[PDB]
């Protein structure tokens, strides 16, 4: 008889001095907040029930009311930032951290969920939860020989809460906290459950989004092989975070990019650059562009894996954002590549699609394309072959696009097009 209660009855029951009346009222409140039709969180907050739930969180003798209040506060902290702030202002962080060590698995799981919802609000509440000392109990909950002995849902919730503790920036998670969490996160990254894998991979992608110091921190744990293995997975929820993490890693030093390459990541890109999902193609092309901005030996490893034809294909037909990432990749290739590599580019058939891409409203893509065409023309000069390249660019209908860009609102575009016209077409 706790279904479809009024906030008035719940308030009257909780305000009584009868622990059982309070328990039934809190259960009614939980059921009201556990509905799928927009829970009445604001009504429960305006009634002043959060402090009473926070107090119930500490009644060890009555574990049912602890569980009910934890569920209710978890659902309240799942809403807007203001509702999570109301939960935190009730003093719920320390109460949930204390319940993390409860002998009842369901109560501890609800505490993990509540702390995860709180930390997911932003950097401020995340760092506050970390200051209150939640990392040590959370990791102690996972300190077991084999993770497979834990319940699937419990482990998934723990993984999600940790990933939220690794999330958000400005500021990024504390360095000590990341060092304390990484071992368990890597242990979870090798688990067999797809949801745990996806969440731990998202956490790793979070930790690798930043300065090269954090990327080095993550890479020192030896996760690049596992990340590449997950990159070749069949489930998109696992491939997406893996690709994001690989991309973040290759945005760092050339040595970290080489660590990625040595793990065999390039061998997976033939299918990533042809993935039916647009986001996968876009982020794979972005990763390829960051790889082509590396050393010449890395460009040569890209060439050896036969990925230049796939970039040509992406430039020929793909979403405009993927095509722009491919143009950036080609520009970096030509800017850092050897003459033989810049010639292999044309031998693969880049000129025609790269020229067809010049007839776009986006100005930055035009600047990138014209820089790439300047670099290729310089590579041709270096072999006394500019004339044949010019005839090629004029045959495919590009010269018309180059001379049309001589009039353009942006200045650098028309300046570069005029330079090219007067320097290689006379």
């Amino acid at each position: 008889g706790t279904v479809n209660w009024s906030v008035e009855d719940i308030v009257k029951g909780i305000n009584s001095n009868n622990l059982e009346s309070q328990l039934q009222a809190t259960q009614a409140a939980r059921k009201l907040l556990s509905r799928e039709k927009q829970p009445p969180i604001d009504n429960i907050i305006r009634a002043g029930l959060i402090p009473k739930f926070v107090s119930f969180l500490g009644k060890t003798d009555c574990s049912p009311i602890q569980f009910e209040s934890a569920w209710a506060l978890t659902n309240i902290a799942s809403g807007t930032s203001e509702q999570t702030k109301a939960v935190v202002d009730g003093g719920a962080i320390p109460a949930f951290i204390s319940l993390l060590a409860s002998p009842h698995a369901h109560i501890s799981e609800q505490a993990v969920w509540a702390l995860g919802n709180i930390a997911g609000d932003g950097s401020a509440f995340r760092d506050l939860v970390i200051k209150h000392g939640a990392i040590d109990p959370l990791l102690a909950l996972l300190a077991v020989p084999d993770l497979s002995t834990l319940a699937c849902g419990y482990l998934r919730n723990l993984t999600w809460t940790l990933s939220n503790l690794c999330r958000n920036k400005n500021p990024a998670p504390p360095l000590d906290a990341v060092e304390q969490i990484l071992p368990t996160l890597v242990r979870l990254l090798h688990h067999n459950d797809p949801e745990v894998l996806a969440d731990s991979c998202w956490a790793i992608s979070y930790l690798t989004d930043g300065p090269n110091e954090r990327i080095e921190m993550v890479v020192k744990k030896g996760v690049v092989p596992q990340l590449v293995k997950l990159l070749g997975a069949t489930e998109l929820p696992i491939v997406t975070p893996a690709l994001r993490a690989i991309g973040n890693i290759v945005t760092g030093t050339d040595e970290q990019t080489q660590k990625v390459i040595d793990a065999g990541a390039l061998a997976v890109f033939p299918s990533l650059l042809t993935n039916p999902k647009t986001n996968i193609q876009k982020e794979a092309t972005w990763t390829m562009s960051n790889i082509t901005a590396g050393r010449q030996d890395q460009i040569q490893q890209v060439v050896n894996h036969g990925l230049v034809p796939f970039l040509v294909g992406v430039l020929s037909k793909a979403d405009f954002k993927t095509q722009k990432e491919a143009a950036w990749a080609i520009t970096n290739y030509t800017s850092g590549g050897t003459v033989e590599q810049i010639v292999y580019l044309v031998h693969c058939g880049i000129i025609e699609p790269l020229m067809n891409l010049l007839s776009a409203k986006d100005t930055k893509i035009i600047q990138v394309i014209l820089d790439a065409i300047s670099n290729i023309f310089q590579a041709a000069e270096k072999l006394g072959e500019t004339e044949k390249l010019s005839i090629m660019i004029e045959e495919c209908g590009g010269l018309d696009k180059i001379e049309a860009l001589q009039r353009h609102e942006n200045e650098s575009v028309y300046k570069a097009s005029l330079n090219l016209i007067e320097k290689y077409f006379s």
Binding site: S34, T74, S78, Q110, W113, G120, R167, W202, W328
Partner: peptide
């Protein structure tokens, strides 16, 4: 030069 970009897990979850 290395550039930056521009299925994620729920930031907050409601039990049931």
């Amino acid at each position: 030069k290395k550039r930056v970009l521009e299925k994620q897990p729920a930031r907050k979850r409601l039990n049931f």
